[PDB]
Design a protein around this nucleic acid. Structure first.
Ligand SMILES: NC[C@@H]1O[C@H](O[C@H]2[C@@H](O)[C@H](O[C@@H]3[C@@H](O)[C@H](N)C[C@H](N)[C@H]3O[C@H]3O[C@H](CO)[C@@H](O)[C@H](O)[C@H]3N)O[C@@H]2CO)[C@H](N)[C@@H](O)[C@@H]1O
Ligand SMILES: [Mg+2]
Ligand SMILES: [Mg+2]
Ligand SMILES: [Mg+2]
Ligand SMILES: [Mg+2]
Ligand SMILES: [Mg+2]
Ligand SMILES: [Mg+2]
Ligand SMILES: [Mg+2]
Ligand SMILES: [Mg+2]
Ligand SMILES: [Mg+2]
Lengths: 402, 221
RNA sequence: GUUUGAAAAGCACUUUGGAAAGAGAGUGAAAUAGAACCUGAAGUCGUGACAAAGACAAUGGAAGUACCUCCAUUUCAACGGCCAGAACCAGCCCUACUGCAUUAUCCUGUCGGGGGUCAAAAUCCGGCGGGCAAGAAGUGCAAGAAGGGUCUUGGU
RNA sequence: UCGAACCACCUAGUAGCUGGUUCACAUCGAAGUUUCCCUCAGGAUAGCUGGUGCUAGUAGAAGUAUUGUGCGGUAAAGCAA
RNA sequence: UUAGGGAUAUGUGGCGUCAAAACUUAUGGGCUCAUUCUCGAUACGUAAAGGGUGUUGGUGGAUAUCCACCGGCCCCGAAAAUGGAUGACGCUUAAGCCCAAUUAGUGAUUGCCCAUUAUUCCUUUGGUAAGGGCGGAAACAAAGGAGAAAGUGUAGCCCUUCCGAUGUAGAUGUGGCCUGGAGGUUAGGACGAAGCUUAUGGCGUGAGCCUAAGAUGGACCGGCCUCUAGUGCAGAUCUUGGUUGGCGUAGCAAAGAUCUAACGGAGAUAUACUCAACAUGCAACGUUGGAUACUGGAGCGGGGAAGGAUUUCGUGCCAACGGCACUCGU
RNA sequence: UAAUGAGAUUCCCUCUGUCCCGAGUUACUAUCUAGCGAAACGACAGUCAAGGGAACGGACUUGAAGGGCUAAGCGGGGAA
RNA sequence: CGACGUCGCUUUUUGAUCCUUCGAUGUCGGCUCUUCCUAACCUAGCGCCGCAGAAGACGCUAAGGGUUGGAUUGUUCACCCACUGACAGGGAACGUGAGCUGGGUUUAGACCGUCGUGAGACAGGUUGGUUUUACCCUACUUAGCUGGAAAUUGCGAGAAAAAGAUUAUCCGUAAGCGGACGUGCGAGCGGUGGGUGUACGGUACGCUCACC
RNA sequence: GUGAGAUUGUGAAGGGAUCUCGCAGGUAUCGUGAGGGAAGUAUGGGGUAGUACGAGAGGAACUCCCAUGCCGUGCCUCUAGUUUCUGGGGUUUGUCGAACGGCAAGUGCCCCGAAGCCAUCGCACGGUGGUUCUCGGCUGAACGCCUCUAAGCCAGAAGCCAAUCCCAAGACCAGAUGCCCAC
RNA sequence: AUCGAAUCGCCACCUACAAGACUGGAGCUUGCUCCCUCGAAGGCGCCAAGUAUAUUCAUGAUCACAAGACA
């Protein structure tokens, strides 16, 4: 007999299996489509999540009820130290797939790059990339570098480079990892001879985030969801909770199937891992590509808001610290907790809708505290509400006593 | 499957010559899909090692729209409880042919698994198969003797590209690049092919004449 | 059932352990007869050594093979009760080699009347003249006293 | 322990109903139908079956034909009988 | 239509693969095209009325063209609840449908594949079984051989011949097997009986019997003829004893709660080196002190009845009990 | 029929997690270890689709899956 | 649209049957949740109208997606209130009780009516009336470990591969063509050594050990 | 061949033969992507426009913007909820002799409360190509004209298949790599 | 280095490619005539490095996996 009333089923069935991610980092399963009429350019960049805040900006949207009026939008801060290129891979088309031809290396690799090869670096011989380093400038090894660079020019359709996050310029105390996060970034643009020349030129040289993205564009954010353990069916799938007088329990799915087919189906919601899942989340509009504090002591300062202040709030981002490097600022949320490495990748969606072409100018960036209720935008404003306090008048008493 | 160091040191302790088993390589351009599959399913099960090549060129009788619907009725089948345990629907022409051979084998014994792993079934002609001897053909299954020429037929590479099989254009550029390469190799040695036959006509009258009218009785002149 | 043993000769003593006990010694034919102690089953379990083995739940039948076997039996010299090969008898089972009848709505010959064709041969119909269409017919019956089988029987 | 307590007995109560019924081979091998029965889940009865035979091994034989001689009112036909 | 096996030949059904056979036979003829349960296709066996200018034959009329009819295949008619079924793949110069052949207008027979059938050859077993031989013919030492019983049934008196053979319920036969005891006979056993054990073979169609080896046992017992019965187990929600998977699993969650140091105790402070300690002896017990709580005078206070009857008390003591623990204990 | 009712019913007020629509915290479990240690159950076992069948198969027919072994769940099957 | 006829599909009704279950398959409806089917209510394309427009009738391809909140009733059903683009119809042991609930049927108490001489009866009304077990196998959900291509072994040799596949340095294309340390001492491309500044802090670039 | 063990049922030291397998891989990173899953779906407003159409009554639609319901995946800046941070304070009864510091009442109670978690109770995001059904056609015969169909073509549905998205080599990846060993 | 094994056709002439209502080339009477490459062979290999009085072969005893195996 049919179900007596209709509701749409619970949970998208295309995000199955809802199992833990195989790896903690965001990894692109597909790059944008290669336009060979463009100029060669990188397509992804790894940033780390550093809390979130909100902004104020006026809206250019003709027809809308909020046209030329100021909105408050939440933004997420993603710290981006530059990544250093260490390799060049090239992939050739087969009827099986897309096979790797080989990789050249940079002749000089970082300590934190070849730390990724060790479960224990400090208690080790540390001699990785040590025979490749010395063979690469022999007579036969300078041949073998140019041997496989030519094999890219013959067989490869896809040229990628291998970068790593360069975590020692990320002077962060809470991201506790010291080995670098390694991914491959695909070159798109030009023919294969024009991709390798851009792959050779930025080799053993750091690439900075504002050379990959622009200020008022969008991107995809490949990132791994915040993990929540084993959760039941109400938290995980969002099923309705049963009436109060139910025996053995409320937070269950009552019927898990008919008598026939005499099996539980994959469509029936069950309990298990919730969170720590990979998500791609397209069309994340970017609002500000920031600049390091060694360059910019005044990061959150706008034309329309001349308060001299950085992007880091009062008392720091909660659980994270201070944004010490370049940063991107995206509209809204990205999947994952703070401190987690995330991949900003160029969009595969058509970036032609009038919401996505819109140029962004800000008017205010909230640099108030995220601990408690934020009240002051700078520490100069808290020293004008509060005058000299007691601990200041006895520090001024030690400074006169000397 | 690359050979391990136990399988590599024994080819150095014993000085193993490079070995190739007796492998019959069928060129399946313009063959009936199930008439070639039944000839192959019997030979594999008589102990023949068979490499099958050019599976995107196999023919199935009928309109392309007809045979494409019969694959989509096959793709309608899946285990509703858990489709990861279901019928797995292979879209490559090289994998459509392996299935059609396999459904003619005793698949659930070891003798029929030793015969389905004797079949390889590439599509296009890969670089390891090209220079390993002349390809063979199945003349009782070749569409010009098996299909009435007024009836439509269906190339398997075209039926399969519209139901899946995202490597149609890759195969078409690997086989355009081969026939260009293999025709450059064949304009070469045309002064080697003509060199021998102008030496095998010149070997006559340089050889004794009592071995020529026995070479003309059996028609080998 | 107390039925340990013939007899308590019911384990002195040594040194590990707080002890239960253990490792040695000793008694006795026997201690794998050490105290509800003759025999010590099946089921079940541990251990040492091996045999392997995908997922067909297992077991099962048939027929071979691979490896094993504190098993049986036979054979070792001008000999076998073992394994092969050919030969030749007999039997039986295969297949080669064919005759007697029958043709007629048929064969052939020319003159017609019919056809088609550039003209005409043929298909077709009809006169009376001859007939054998001769491994000639796929029509009736066939009785023609072998070359091959016999790990399809027995023998020397 | 209650719409007739508990104990021992009569008592191994009685059951046309349910369950069980321990070695091998050989020679033969059925019935669910008839009649009667407070009979319809049972019996007795005839039949089919086995065992023992007996009697002068072709006799008083036959799920069959042929020839002769009887019996019939179903199919068809008819409604102009 | 059925004893235990071979060889040949069939039957029903088949010969594209699975799967034996047309290594997809012919040197046969036609017909058929069908685009989301996907034309069609092994009888029994589980879609119709009606329609088609799809194709292929027929019939009867008329002036190369029309008209009315009838048939074959194909399409429409033709819509259900897990993904699905000519058995599967597939097949379309069929591997489909209807006819027809047998190596093809060549000269005459039977293309070949499969049975618990048929023919025939062996072996067994039983007959309403049918015949023959059984007065030792002569002769023959060791250093050509053995048997020959007047017989229902045997290791069958010996040969030859013929036919049958499956079977529930059931009947019957068996010099058919097995167990306890009894009457007789003939023998075993401390040089090892019964019992037990089995990659211990042997042989019997079988029930079973017998040998061997025990690095098992330690005193009784076999065979044959008769007699006798508490005489044969796989199952009765069978009886009694034991064991086992579940399984080191469910659990040991009311009555708030314990911490500390010193002593006691075998219960520790327990280590092969080249080691300073942590990272290699953990957990747990009693007593007194101290800290922290609780019961809260309808008390985990102090006495009695009923009931119990040594649980009282001291001292030893820890095997089993006090579902954890114990050095404590009713 | 006043009074009375752990009686049966209906509406209104207050009221609220009954609900929209769920979230979050606590104690105790579960969970992991130390000690201790069962039972119910158990022919044999355990992946499916269709077909047939005593006319709803884990075993049969033809297909489709299936490397082995685990921990916590869970209530569709085992006509549990 | 379609009488009179007629040929059928359907198994969400009911009747008929008695095949399976009486050493037991938990016997209604809600609630929950997933999936299927199409005979399509809404949505995507359409054809056709007694289709001017607007609303709509009929039909086709399509089951991808959606298909409600309530009053009364134990209800399936029904019936109105209201929203909506629309509030389509069904299946899965009349899906789903070791998922719940227990209103209702379906015991023992009691009352009423009709029946009965009575005990009692009542597909009549009423009220009150224990919903037990997963720790096993599978399935499904997540969470670990780990072999294996003769899917454990054979030594049973197949590369989506190079081109001496017959001897042997590379580079770049086939005809061509670039150079390749020389003989324990040397040299060359190089990994690590000492002192005064450059590129986007510390790594690179200037000027003793292996190999050719 | 070379290493390592075992031959454990009846005492002991010896050393013969035989059997079992060890004799090459280990570790670390970047990817491939078969196959399987699979998702976004609806609505209202603006103007177009009081226009098309119509005697009048009446009365459309596409491009194009702006929002929204249902669903999905996240998120915690804001706002809201939650407090065993018993955080700071307030308050009642008992109680350490009183103040101090507290404590008891299974967290005494009341107000505010970080962080964390969390709400359609807040916030952000939710995309491409083809194939071909219905159908309307184009050339074009059968059938000297006609005809979308017979060959052949065109355009083309929220269906279907891919892209994106999620898992992913028992899909056994001579895909690439770092360092050791072994040849 | 265990290892004894089953396998028994080699090629830098096949190892290029379409077609079958054609695919040697042309004529014009379009089904016939005409041209040489005659339209039905991938080459080798099968015991003198090549068709010529050249020289080993047992006893491995009459079949047995070929007792050989770099072609
Ligand atoms: N191991 C396989 C099993 O052996 C069993 O039987 C075995 C045992 O009963 C039997 O026992 C052995 C005996 O062989 C051997 N020669 C002497 C030994 N005394 C016996 O062993 C006996 O005694 C010892 C202590 O004395 C006990 O521990 C042991 O449980 C007991 N079986 O050895 C037999 C094998 O030869 C079962 N019959 C059988 O189910 C199975 O085959
Ligand atoms: Mg966390
Ligand atoms: Mg029968
Ligand atoms: Mg019987
Ligand atoms: Mg008895
Ligand atoms: Mg507990
Ligand atoms: Mg108190
Ligand atoms: Mg205890
Ligand atoms: Mg009262
Ligand atoms: Mg896919």
């Amino acid at each position: 007999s049919h179900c007596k009333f209709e509701h749409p089923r619970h949970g998208h069935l295309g995000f199955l299996p809802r199992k833990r991610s195989r790896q903690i980092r965001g990894r692109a399963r597909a790059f944008p489509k290669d336009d060979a009429t463009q100029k060669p350019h990188l397509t992804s960049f790894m940033v780390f999540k550093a809390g979130m805040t909100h902004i104020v900006r006026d809206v250019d949207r003709p027809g809308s009820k909020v046209n030329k009026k100021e909105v408050v939008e939440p933004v997420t801060i993603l710290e981006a130290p530059p990544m250093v290129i260490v390799g060049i891979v090239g992939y050739r088309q087969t009827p099986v797939g897309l096979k790797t031809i080989g990789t050249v290396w940079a002749h000089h690799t970082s300590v934190e790059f070849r730390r990724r090869y060790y479960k224990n670096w400090k208690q080790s011989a540390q001699l990785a990339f040590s025979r490749q380093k010395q063979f690469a400038n022999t007579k036969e090894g300078k041949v073998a570098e140019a041997r496989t660079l030519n094999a890219f020019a013959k067989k490869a359709s896809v040229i990628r480079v291998i970068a790593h996050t360069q975590l020692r310029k990320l002077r962060n105390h809470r991201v506790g990892v010291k080995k670098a996060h390694v991914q491959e970034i695909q070159i798109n643009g030009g023919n294969v001879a024009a991709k390798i020349a851009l792959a050779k030129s930025l080799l053993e040289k750091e690439v900075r985030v504002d050379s990959v993205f622009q200020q008022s564009e969008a991107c995809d954010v490949c990132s791994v969801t915040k993990g929540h353990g084993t959760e039941g069916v109400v938290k995980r799938w969002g099923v309705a909770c049963l009436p109060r007088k139910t025996h053995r329990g409320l937070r269950k799915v009552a019927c898990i199937g008919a008598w026939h087919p005499a099996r539980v189906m994959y469509t029936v919601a069950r309990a298990g891992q919730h969170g720590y899942h990979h998500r791609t989340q397209l069309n994340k509009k970017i609002y500000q590509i920031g600049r390091s504090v060694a360059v910019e002591p005044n990061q959150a300062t706008t034309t329309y808001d001349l308060t001299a202040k950085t992007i880091t709030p009062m008392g720091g981002f909660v659980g994270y610290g201070t944004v010490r490097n370049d940063y991107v600022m995206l509209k809204g949320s990205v999947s994952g907790p703070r401190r987690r490495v995330m991949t900003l990748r160029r969009p595969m969606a058509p970036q032609t809708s009038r919401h996505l072409k819109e140029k962004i100018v800000l008017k205010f960036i909230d640099t108030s505290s995220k601990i408690g209720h934020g009240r002051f935008q700078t520490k100069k404003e808290k020293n004008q509400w509060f005058g000299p306090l007691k601990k200041d008048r006895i520090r001024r008493e030690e400074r006169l006593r000397k | 499957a690359f050979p391990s160091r136990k399988d590599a040191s024994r080819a150095q302790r014993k000085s193993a010559k490079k070995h190739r088993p007796e492998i019959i390589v069928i060129d399946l351009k313009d063959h009936v899909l199930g008439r070639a599959a039944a000839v192959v399913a019997k030979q594999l099960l008589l102990g023949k090692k068979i490499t099958v090549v050019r599976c995107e060129q196999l023919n199935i009788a009928g309109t392309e729209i007809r045979n494409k619907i019969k694959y989509l009725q096959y793709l309608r089948k899946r285990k509703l409880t858990n489709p990861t345990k279901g019928p797995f629907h292979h879209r490559a022409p090289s994998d459509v042919f392996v299935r059609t051979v396999r459904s003619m084998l005793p698949r659930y014994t070891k003798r029929g698994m030793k015969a389905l792993n004797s079949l390889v079934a590439y599509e296009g002609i890969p670089p390891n198969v090209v220079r390993t001897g002349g390809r063979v053909v199945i003349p009782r299954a070749q569409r010009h003797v098996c299909y009435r020429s007024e009836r439509p037929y269906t190339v398997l590479g075209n039926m399969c590209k519209h139901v899946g099989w995202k490597y149609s254009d890759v195969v078409a550029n690997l086989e355009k690049a081969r026939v260009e390469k293999a025709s450059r190799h064949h304009e070469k040695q045309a002064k080697l092919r003509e060199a021998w036959k102008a030496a095998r006509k010149e070997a006559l009258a340089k050889m004794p004449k009592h071995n020529v009218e026995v070479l003309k009785k059996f028609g080998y002149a």
